[PDB]
């Protein structure tokens, strides 16, 4: 029952704007302080923003102080995160977040009812802002053509934004396929490759192909890898 | 700003076995107010210890918080096929509060050689400006590998990029692919290209490698 749902990702220019939203249900929304996490490339998590329950108290974290605005609406259970002047570093997935129902003051006092933004008991399943200059660009897929057995793959070059989606044989291939995570390239542009260990004497007869899906470029790819 | 620091980056654990990790704090740190939480793949995370010792809603027993000043640790007793996860230390005695950089909690199975391939640049490719090289290291333990690519026997350095995929949750093993990326000009001016891996699970660096057009 107890549900937290986001909403505002997607891709935004360097200098441009963004307001996130969280939907708390299932709780008393009024007595739980709130905050957002998010959570770079590759990386663990970042403290962003927290407020308590009357919204009356709100910190936030040193690369964002000054850039994000965070606000609660306790008659409407949401609770909002302003971003304005956002930069590339600031891509990640932002966690809205459910702190604590109490707080204790400088003399050690513990005040039932007015949570806070110590900890999170509650998270959403999260959105994801892309910040970048970047064009759409659809990818160049190229063969990667071919102990006992042998390997082969595709390479999905220089594409933007994520995802692709790589499948071998129209779906019919999935054991021996190893999909890897795509590389950010010094260019803005991502780049991946697909591969797949087969044994290497049914390269004469069975055909493989590997199928490229790209729908922000409108780009499907059916690539035929041969010796 | 407080800083977090986590050890082991990454602790390869056995199932039943007890498991320590250790968060360091550059300041110290009341010890009622500190957190840990866990990470699975794809999913959110999730409060697993709060203010200090605390277990948070609906926590398994086996897990356990310590610590004070600037040196605190999370244990799990006996560690279960459902707890190898990310684990994050998180700080708030003092704003701005501050997570660690997490400690990867592996499976830790028997050494596994990788299988090493090599693949040239398609001609479709060199028909563009550009040649890609990949170096394919399927299927092994631990993840630890160093990829050497060499020119001529020059060996190369800045301009490669590795990838290597989650944990495999039926053999437990690794894979990784590191591609070398030349202008077709530099791809044209030399001859033999080659991939040197040096893994725990290779008695000696294993080369695979072609000549340019061969």
């Known amino acids: 029952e107890v549900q937290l749902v986001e909403s505002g990702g997607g891709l935004i220019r360097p200098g441009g704007s963004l307001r996130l939203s969280c939907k708390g249900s299932?709780?008393?929304?009024?007595?739980?302080?709130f905050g957002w996490v998010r959570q770079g490339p590759g990386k663990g998590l970042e403290w962003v923003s927290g407020?308590?329950?009357?919204?009356?108290?709100?910190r936030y974290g040193d690369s964002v102080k000054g850039r994000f605005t965070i606000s609660r609406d306790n008659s409407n259970n949401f609770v909002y995160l302003q971003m304005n002047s956002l930069r590339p570093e600031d891509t990640a997935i932002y966690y809205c977040a459910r702190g604590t129902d109490y707080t204790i003051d400088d003399q050690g006092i513990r005040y039932q009812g007015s949570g806070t933004f110590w900890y999170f008991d509650v998270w959403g399943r999260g959105t994801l802002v892309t910040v970048s200059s970047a064009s759409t660009k659809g990818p160049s897929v190229f063969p990667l053509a071919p102990g006992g057995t042998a390997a082969l793959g595709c390479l999905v070059k220089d594409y933007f934004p994520e995802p692709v989606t790589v499948s071998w044989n129209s779906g019919a291939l999935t054991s021996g396929v190893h999909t890897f995570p795509a590389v950010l390239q010094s260019s803005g542009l991502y780049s991946l490759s697909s591969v797949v260990t087969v044994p290497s004497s049914s390269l004469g007869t069975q055909t493989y192909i590997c199928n490229v899906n790209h729908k922000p470029s409108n780009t499907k790819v059916d690539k035929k890898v041969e010796p | 700003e407080i800083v977090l620091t986590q050890s082991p980056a990454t602790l390869s654990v056995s199932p039943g076995e007890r498991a320590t990790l250790s968060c360091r704090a550059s300041q110290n740190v009341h010890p009622r107010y500190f957190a840990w939480y866990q990470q699975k793949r794809g999913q959110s995370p999730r409060l697993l210890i709060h203010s200090g010792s605390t277990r948070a809603a609906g926590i398994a027993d086996r897990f356990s918080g310590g610590g004070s000043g600037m040196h605190f640790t999370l244990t799990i007793t006996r560690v279960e096929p459902e707890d190898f996860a990310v684990y994050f230390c998180?700080?708030?005695?003092?704003?701005?509060?501050?997570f660690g950089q997490g400690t990867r909690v592996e499976l830790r199975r028997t050494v596994a050689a990788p299988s090493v391939f090599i693949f040239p640049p398609s001609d479709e490719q060199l028909k563009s400006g550009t040649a890609s090289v990949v170096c394919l290291l399927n299927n092994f333990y631990p993840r630890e590998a160093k990829v050497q690519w060499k020119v001529d026997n020059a060996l190369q350095s800045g301009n490669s990029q590795e990838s290597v995929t989650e944990q495999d949750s039926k053999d437990s093993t690794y894979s990784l692919s590191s591609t070398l990326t030349l202008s077709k000009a530099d791809y044209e001016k030399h001859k033999v290209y080659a991939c040197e891996v040096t893994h725990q699970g290779l008695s000696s660096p294993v080369t695979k490698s072609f000549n340019r057009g061969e």
């Open positions: 407020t308590n329950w009357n919204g009356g108290d709100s």
């Open positions: 299932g709780f008393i929304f009024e007595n739980f302080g």
């Open positions: 998180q700080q708030y005695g003092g704003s701005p509060y501050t």
